[PDB]
Enzyme design. Structure first.
Site, short mmCIF file in Angstrom:
data_model
loop_
_atom_site.label_atom_id
_atom_site.label_comp_id
_atom_site.label_asym_id
_atom_site.label_seq_id
_atom_site.Cartn_x
_atom_site.Cartn_y
_atom_site.Cartn_z
N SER A 81 0.82 -1.47 0.28
CA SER A 81 0.17 -0.13 -0.24
C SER A 81 0.86 1.13 -0.08
CB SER A 81 -1.04 -0.35 1.11
OG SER A 81 -2.39 0.89 0.89
N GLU B 253 -9.40 -4.85 -3.42
CA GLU B 253 -8.92 -3.70 -2.27
C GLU B 253 -9.45 -2.65 -0.90
OE1 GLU B 253 -5.52 -4.08 -1.96
OE2 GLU B 253 -4.48 -4.74 -4.11
N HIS C 152 -8.05 -5.72 1.88
CA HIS C 152 -6.34 -5.16 1.47
C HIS C 152 -5.76 -5.22 2.77
CE1 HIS C 152 -4.14 -0.52 2.15
NE2 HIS C 152 -3.96 -1.34 0.84
#
Ligand SMILES: *[C@@H]1O[C@H](CO)[C@@H](O)[C@H](O)[C@H]1NC(C)=O
Ligand SMILES: *[C@@H]1O[C@H](CO)[C@@H](O)[C@H](O)[C@H]1NC(C)=O
Ligand SMILES: *[C@@H]1O[C@H](CO)[C@@H](O)[C@H](O)[C@H]1NC(C)=O
Ligand SMILES: *[C@@H]1O[C@H](CO)[C@@H](O)[C@H](O)[C@H]1NC(C)=O
Ligand SMILES: [Cl-]
Ligand SMILES: [Cl-]
Lengths: 532, 529
Positions: B197, B324, B437
């Site tokens: 990320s 995500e 995520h």
């Protein structure tokens, strides 16, 4: 006599014709207006003055002056649509098929031919009214109207060429029917106007125009609606094209008066030879002279009239064919041929969308492209061909019609929608073209019932149920024969939006005809193009 | 000793730790910078001054000052991402796990945590480097960097708070690895940086930045790329959020110097309390203080750099997860709940896309809505939910990454793309959230290899091939040891799924939606916004 009829304009003598082992009366080429010739070209039509003696109505009349398709010389697929009678500006006539013995006060159906407002004839073999008149016992009338510049040259302000005269020709034929059809066994109170494409758009226009509303009971629109992008132009655009016609003919362009006078002195074929040169862009499915939003035949914009319910509230039956766009790609877009599968390269797909959505800006073109492209497989020629086919059909016919049906239904008294998707067994066009624009007509007119035509038994059956749907609808306002064992065509409602398929298989009911793509064409694209 | 190591800044003493019925060496909390405190707040990091004696590197360091999630108290799903050490501005440290016995010049992998640039710690259980370092025989380093205002407050022009200092912290830890890893048996010439990320975006930023290129050999980017819409801001926007931060705190706004002096007087928590108030829109997947395109750390715009090839040419292995976006819908969009199926009404869907694409004008929102709505079944709550989920993930992670991948491969020397879609059998989040995520992380770090964590045997198998794919790539620039993970190419665009099933190869990861997000929407917004 059955064949001798006295009308308010004069006497008329019809002829007895054979029809599927029986016989029916036909009154062909009855005049309903004064010949729109000489100083009357471009003018509103005038009632045919009474004649004395007996008018011989035993043969088809002339066809109006129009462009003639010479793309495939001798090919029946294209030529069945060309005038099959001598062309003449003296063309405002109508035909009638009356059941024998003559009915007392029977249902009447009035056919309005299509041809993009630039062509069309009431005398084509596919419009032969005898099979439907005989089979469904209705009084069938086929009218005619001026096409091309002769019918829609528009110089707003002028009273010599106001525009919309072809629509007025249609109205006068409707007034004639309202005045004289009782003399043929028809009920002026129960007349259904139906037409395909330009004719379908026309029907929707009479539903909209106040001056036309009271001249018919209900309507059937096939592959066409009043709001189609190719079906009307603004006074400005219309004026521009009229002046451009003059320019192409070296005309005095100083005043409408002179321009018009110049144009009135040319031979028909001269106007026609340059007809296509006045279009704004290189395009497909766009015609030069079409109805104008004038503030007269059409009080206000079509959208505002649709929104306000400002139109005739009655029952309508309407629909489309699966591949409305194929005919037009074949004639005007790169990569298409009637003698090949016409697999389209990405390059040709790109030029195809520009041709298809001529008014769109670059961003607009990109949206259409994204909406109809499978990016996992963009060089697939078949997907590219079919994608382009859908674009032409969705934009020009299907979505405008869905818009119309949804708006109309909010105020109407019954809507029946169909999706015709049967590919005829004896079709002369290549398979990639699918269920072509105009090919539901032969079923509506009962052609499959004539054995020498070699349609399948399933096709004759499909024609019979289509003719019965059309006729029963005309008689009662409902395609379904109440309390009957057969599957029922449901009403299209604003909530459920049901429609049925029209093919040789048992009835299937569906909902929201092509909603996805039509949300794109009716809501999103206009928003994007308006943006700037 | 094996635990006693002499580095260029001083001596450090590690600790022998257990790892799967065995042991390795762990040097925890080594300082790589001077504490960025007091007058140093907002400033570029400074190399840590050498100390005498032995630095005690036996325990984890403090975590940097950051927002703490209290949405679900006691809940392991959210709490596992929260700081598990005291928070302090004195937080610039790194940790190292070294195989035992200590190897000779071995591959080095450096982890960069995510957390949207506003949060994150190097000490979380899921970043425990012992399993990977041990199993794959690599020297594993996890660095730290300032997050929130402390690391990204940007007042371009000022040398007191220039912006990007969190990135510079990351750079200095890399510079430290370059300089000292050889004493831990690490090969400074074969260093692979990897992060998830904000960490993945970070890795991408070091690929682009001239000042960072020579401090690593290759890169792995997980669910994040430098061009992500939330990963950077312009100097003008960074400056206005800085000023607004001061406004929220009743600061003197007459000059950068006064504003900064005011902010340096505030207790860390005071800053954090108002951090979210400077965002320009009601939004989700948007964070206040992030990297600034300054013309220094980033010579020019990210796109121009990607276009001209102005970036490090090497091998990159990267990918995304199947869902995500759900974490962010759960936290900021109406209709979502951790305890229900979260069927989404039409109203909530409309609201949701507005929150997901804050910057779009109405036509932009209509375009997005049309692209993700099934008009044959628009009141299907499940489809509405999954649709919103795809919008958030596609727009914030997947499509920006695909754009990066396509641009990088033109110039790069080897691209390996993955699409992780295995839903862990033991997840504590609800089914609707899918492959969340950050949840591929536990597989990369080998948590499925520890028995009391209750993963399935095919999950341990998956983790092992991921760890091996990762480490083999780090060592050679190719995840494959001589089923092959294909090279992603401009022409073919192949990629592999990462799940318990046998490896399948696909092509054009979400190409349809990404054409929309990468080409059409940007064009639409440029033409009408
Ligand atoms: C009407 O025209 C047709 C064909 O020209 C002809 O057969 C018929 O005799 C005509 N009728 C009269 C009364 O002239
Ligand atoms: C048509 O009109 C009559 C009243 O005028 C009404 O009772 C009937 O419901 C209407 N039919 C439809 C389908 O709207
Ligand atoms: C390092 O610090 C920890 C306490 O935080 C202590 O238990 C340990 O014994 C220390 N080691 C040395 C050698 O000081
Ligand atoms: C990496 O560089 C070498 C030498 O320049 C070259 O032979 C090879 O093709 C490159 N690999 C890729 C996949 O670009
Ligand atoms: Cl016959
Ligand atoms: Cl353990």
């Amino acid at each position: 006599s059955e064949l001798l009829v006295n009308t308010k304009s004069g006497k008329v003598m019809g002829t007895r014709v054979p029809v599927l082992s029986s016989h029916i009366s036909a009154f062909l080429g009855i005049p309903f207006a004064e010949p729109p010739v000489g100083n009357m070209r471009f003018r509103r039509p005038e009632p045919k003055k009474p004649w004395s003696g007996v008018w011989n109505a035993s043969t088809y009349p002339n066809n109006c002056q129009q462009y003639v398709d010479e793309q495939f010389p001798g090919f029946s697929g294209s030529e069945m649509w060309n005038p099959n009678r001598e062309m003449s500006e003296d063309c405002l006539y109508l035909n009638i098929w009356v059941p024998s013995p003559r009915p007392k006060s029977t249902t009447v159906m009035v056919w309005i031919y299509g041809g993009g407002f630039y062509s069309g004839s009431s005398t084509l073999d596919v419009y032969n009214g005898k099979y439907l008149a005989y089979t469904e016992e209705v009084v069938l009338v086929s009218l005619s109207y001026r096409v091309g510049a002769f019918g829609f040259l528009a110089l707003h302000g002028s009273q010599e060429a106001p525009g919309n005269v072809g629509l007025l020709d249609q109205r006068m034929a409707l007034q004639w029917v309202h005045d004289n059809i009782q003399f043929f066994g028809g009920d002026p109170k129960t007349v259904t106007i139906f037409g395909e494409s330009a004719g379908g758009a026309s029907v929707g226009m009479h539903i909209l125009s106040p001056g036309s509303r009271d001249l018919f009971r209900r309507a059937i629109l096939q592959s066409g609606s009043p709001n189609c992008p190719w079906a009307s132009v603004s006074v400005a655009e219309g004026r521009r094209r009229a002046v451009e016609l003059g320019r192409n003919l070296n005309c005095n362009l100083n005043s409408d008066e002179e321009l018009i006078h110049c144009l009135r002195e040319k031979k028909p074929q001269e106007l026609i030879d340059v007809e296509w040169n006045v279009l704004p862009f290189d395009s497909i499915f766009r015609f030069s002279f079409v109805p104008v939003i004038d503030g007269e035949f059409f009080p206000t914009s079509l959208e505002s009239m649709l929104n306000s319910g400002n139109f005739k509230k009655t029952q309508i039956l309407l629909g489309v064919n699966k591949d409305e766009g194929s005919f037009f790609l074949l004639y005007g877009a790169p990569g298409f041929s009637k003698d090949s599968e016409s697999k389209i390269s990405r390059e040709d797909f790109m030029s195809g969308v520009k041709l298809s959505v001529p008014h769109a800006n670059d961003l607009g073109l990109d949206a259409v492209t994204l909406q109809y492209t499978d990016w996992m497989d963009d060089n697939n020629g078949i997907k590219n061909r079919d994608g382009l086919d859908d674009i032409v059909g969705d934009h020009n016919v299907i979505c405008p019609l869905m818009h119309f049906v949804n708006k109309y239904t909010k105020f109407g008294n019954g809507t029946y929608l169909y999706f015709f998707n049967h590919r005829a067994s004896n079709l002369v066009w290549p398979e990639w073209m699918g269920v072509i624009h105009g090919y539901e007509i032969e079923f509506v007119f009962g052609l499959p019932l004539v054995k020498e035509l070699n349609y399948t038994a399933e096709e004759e059956a499909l024609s019979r149920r289509i003719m019965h749907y059309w006729a029963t609808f005309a008689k009662t306002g409902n395609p379904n024969e109440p309390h009957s064992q057969e599957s029922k065509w449901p009403l299209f409602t604003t909530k459920e939006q049901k429609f049925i398929d029209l093919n040789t298989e048992p009835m299937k009911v569906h909902q929201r005809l092509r909603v996805q793509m039509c949300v794109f064409w009716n809501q999103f694209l206009p928003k994007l193009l308006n943006a700037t």
